[PDB]
Design a protein around this ligand. Structure first.
Ligand SMILES: NC1=N[C@@H]2CC[C@H](NC(=O)c3cccc(Cl)c3)C[C@@H]2CS1
Length: 390
């Protein structure tokens, strides 16, 4: 019955623009909004004016700033930045009551990284040292936090999708979810928490052992589901699937929803589809179940998501009264990515101390009168470690 009221509701944002938490850096404290990112391992903040930044880190104004006299260059598939490494004192106001000295990449140049109107000015990489830039000697924030305090080595995330689009006033005003640092808040989920092992501590890597679309088995060699890895990543919008899986899944989703036909651009994730107010035909779209390796030998469990999760609400071009959505599943050449739109269905427990990730149905997940998201088990499943790619 852990309650963490200082932390409940400490997030804002939306799957399309990222979820962020308020943080302070430096002495006296400089307030910044920071993207919560389980798919990376650098704490990096805007440190120089940029047209899309409303504020930034001013190292010269901080008496506790330490310069590491080393640059870092961080290119992504889309976008990139460069920065200067340093350390400073850092707190999370709606977090545990602690201040820690942590590595900070002070971003001085960037290209297609900051997003007009995102409302965040930096990123908090919550994954492990192995994928930190420049190399694995740069201790990640969470590692400093646990080393320097008594905060238990665990965090949990409830990302709350509205189920409808939010204009910028609403998105600033609305509670977007909870990051619970050092614990599990029982009010953020229903049902049981089920756990999957962290396969290796770099990304939050997991193993998927079966996929179903409306109960029907996708029936691929399970290695395909994890080629070349499967990760849980709050800093990616979509559910991303390896090319072959993506194709198979889209074929199956088209077939189940085939009473209605959509543009190729919809399935490519590029164009919106709109229905008359209140008439979105949720029931024609299938549920998607991912089975994950369990903690017990030969046992798995499954998480089930709705189209309310994988159809991302977007504002109309004509700005009409229609309910509009983009298809939030896309192909990946870097393995499966369980992005923000999947995490919106679940309360996700990143149990680093026990090297496992928990899932439970989210208390804030969007659904309808007839179906809800689910986390169910156990299932007898054999040869699961063979699903892992090498
Ligand atoms: N996990 C990853 N992290 C890095 C840094 C965050 C960035 N994400 C965003 O800007 C962003 C933009 C809009 C929505 C969301 Cl959820 C995130 C991606 C890259 C590559 S993948």
């Amino acid at each position: 019955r852990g309650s963490f009221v200082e932390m409940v509701d400490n997030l804002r944002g939306k799957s399309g623009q990222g979820y962020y938490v308020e943080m302070t850096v430096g002495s006296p404290p400089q307030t910044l909004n920071i993207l919560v990112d389980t798919g990376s391992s650098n704490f990096a903040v805007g440190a120089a004016p940029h047209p899309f930044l409303h504020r930034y880190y001013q190292r010269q104004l901080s008496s506790t700033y330490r310069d590491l006299r080393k640059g870092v260059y961080v290119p992504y598939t889309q976008g990139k930045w460069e920065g200067e490494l340093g350390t400073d004192l850092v707190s999370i106001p709606h977090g545990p009551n602690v201040t820690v000295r942590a590595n900070i990449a002070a971003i001085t140049e960037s290209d297609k990284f900051f997003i007009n109107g995102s409302n965040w000015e930096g990123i908090l990489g919550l994954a492990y040292a192995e994928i930190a830039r420049p190399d694995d000697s740069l201790e990640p924030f969470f590692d400093s936090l646990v080393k320097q305090t008594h905060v238990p080595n665990l965090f949990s995330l409830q990302l709350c999708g509205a189920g409808f689009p939010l204009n910028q006033s609403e998105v600033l005003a609305s509670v977007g979810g909870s990051m619970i640092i050092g614990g599990i808040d029982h009010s953020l989920y229903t049902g049981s928490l089920w756990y999957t092992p962290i396969r290796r501590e770099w990304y939050y890597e997991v193993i998927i052992v079966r996929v179903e679309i409306n109960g029907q088995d996708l029936k691929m060699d399970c290695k395909e589901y994890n080629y070349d890895k499967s990760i849980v990543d709050s800093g990616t919008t979509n559910l991303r699937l390896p090319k072959k899986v993506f194709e198979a899944a889209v074929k199956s989703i088209k077939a189940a929803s085939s009473t209605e036909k959509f543009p190729d651009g919809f399935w490519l994730g590029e164009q919106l589809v709109c229905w008359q107010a209140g008439t979105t035909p949720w029931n024609i779209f299938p549920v998607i179940s991912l089975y994950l390796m369990g903690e017990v030998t030969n046992q798995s469990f499954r998480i089930t998501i709705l189209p309310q999760q994988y159809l991302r609400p977007v504002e109309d071009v004509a700005t009409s009264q229609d309910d509009c959505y983009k298809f939030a599943i896309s192909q990946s050449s870097t393995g499966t990515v369980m992005g923000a739109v999947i995490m919106e269905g679940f309360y996700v427990v990143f149990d680093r101390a026990r090297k496992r990730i928990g899932f439970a149905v989210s208390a804030c997940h969007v659904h309808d009168e007839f179906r809800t998201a689910a986390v169910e088990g156990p299932f007898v499943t054999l040869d699961m470690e063979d699903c892992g790619y090498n």
